[PDB]
Design a protein around this ligand. Sequence first.
Ligand SMILES: O=S(=O)(O)CCNCc1ccccc1
Length: 658
Amino acid sequence: ISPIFQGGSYQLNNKSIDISSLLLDKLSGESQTVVMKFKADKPNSLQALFGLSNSKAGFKNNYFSIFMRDSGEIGVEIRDAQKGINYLFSRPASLWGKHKGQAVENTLVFVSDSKDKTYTMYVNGIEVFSETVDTFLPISNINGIDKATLGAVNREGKEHYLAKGSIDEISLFNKAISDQEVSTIPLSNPFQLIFQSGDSTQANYFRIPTLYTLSSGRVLSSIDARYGGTHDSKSKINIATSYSDDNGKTWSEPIFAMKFNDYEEQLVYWPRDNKLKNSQISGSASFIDSSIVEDKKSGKTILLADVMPAGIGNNNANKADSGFKEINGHYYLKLKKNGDNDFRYTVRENGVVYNETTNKPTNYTINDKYEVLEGGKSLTVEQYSVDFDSGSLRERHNGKQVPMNVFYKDSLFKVTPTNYIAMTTSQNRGESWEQFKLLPPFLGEKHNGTYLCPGQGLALKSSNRLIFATYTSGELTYLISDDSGQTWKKSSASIPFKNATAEAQMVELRDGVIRTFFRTTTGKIAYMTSRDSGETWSKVSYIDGIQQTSYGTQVSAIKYSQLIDGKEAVILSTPNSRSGRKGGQLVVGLVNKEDDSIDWKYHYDIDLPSYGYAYSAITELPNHHIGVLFEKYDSWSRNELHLSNVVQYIDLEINDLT
Ligand SMILES: O=S(=O)(O)CCNCc1ccccc1
């Protein structure tokens, strides 16, 4: 249907615009849709874009508004004091402010549906909330509405929630338009989605993006496909990948690089209320924090990620146990059988389950998928699904049998409840992945494994050496392979932090010279340098000119192929804020060839200093543009958990940065 009202080119300069005479007598029936294209690159702390109100004395709580915050949050209020209704629906991190130094036109669609008693908000093609209520309040059925306002809400004759911005287009319809119709509305987005709710992963949430440019020109991305909200492990999380063959313009439907089947792959709307938001899937195995490298020699793509057995995360992982037993020079995965109090088994060569107590082999084997076989026959367990039907999180058997895996809760043989690192490879540049293999322990029998640094591994340009940074208490532990990832050794580098989440990413400044940038607990990004391809490492220094919070955020980094201002360039991606995960920047550093010091010369603001920016991935695309895949929200904040479609991709050119 056509709109009942359509207007545009409204400048909101801290002074509301009255459109009552144009709009109010057009509103009819109980269902409405608002479509608004607007910019706000300098918003006030809290501002209303659109209002319908009773402006009379004594009715200050009788209004409908669409409002936004300078955090990027969008919402509505629907209030009628006589009816005793005060609805407030919102979602943080729903907006864009600026892109390449120009105000972004956001496309907002709000649907108020009296038949289904549902209010739904979309911004930039993304559904940010949908709420059904028992008692529906039609937005123009508020008692005594007499004002329709842009850029404020008129309460008792005065302008509340004054806005700074512009409304380039606004249309209203006397209908609740369908989800289908909504998808036909043209967008002006500065970003793309690679992974998204409803795609092949069936995860409603994503965190921990990676990007890596392959020698063929294909660009590969990996990510945590997070099912149980945005919570870290313990949860259900798989590792998913997608690639682009056209410099990031289009992306393939995701596949899994690493997945477990003990719990169903469910798209769930995780509760965001204060009573339930900490609900966490507690009996599932998971993968978390992936990293990618390409090996020139074999041509293989290699992906590592952490592996968590059922119910395990970084807080409950046994720090005093590697999960392997050393038996005369070699490491074997330990197992515990149903009914035993101790781990009396190991997995030996060709997956043979061996009884340590009587030194006898059993009739059980572990296959390449870490599944349990008895006499060559596959054992199974019943799968779990999760629901909130009862008003709290329930995890329950769903009738489906899946192969019995030693990382599962229901398995006959169970691994040590600690954290592991696994590796998988692809021979077809991400079209398919092999079954993963566990890496051996590097810090001994009675030390839990290190944690992989998400993002990229490093393929040294002048050799066959591959390095993945990892972290643990008191050091970075670099994992080094010179044989296409068949065998690994560690190189340890002490850091002056205990229990830091020291997520580290590397750039090769010149042949054999590696600088590693890493997250600390000091509010400053740190770095160290190797001049012998990772064998030995310098002391730790800090970057001035960038701020992080006390808890820190992952930082991504690449060595740009082209000179900038006649110099070798490194590009860092990080939030720049001492307050939260916001104020995203790309920072271009120029290398001084005399001492390898870096002059951090240009800071490019990804979006507003107040808008969210957390973990990130950056890569030089084959056409020398820069691709950035990043968490566009505060992934630390307890107010911004469980948001969909906030991991987003943008394309930048060096000219945009400098
Ligand atoms: O809290 S955050 O800084 O956003 C993310 C930190 N994830 C650490 C982790 C790594 C591996 C397993 C569990 C937890």
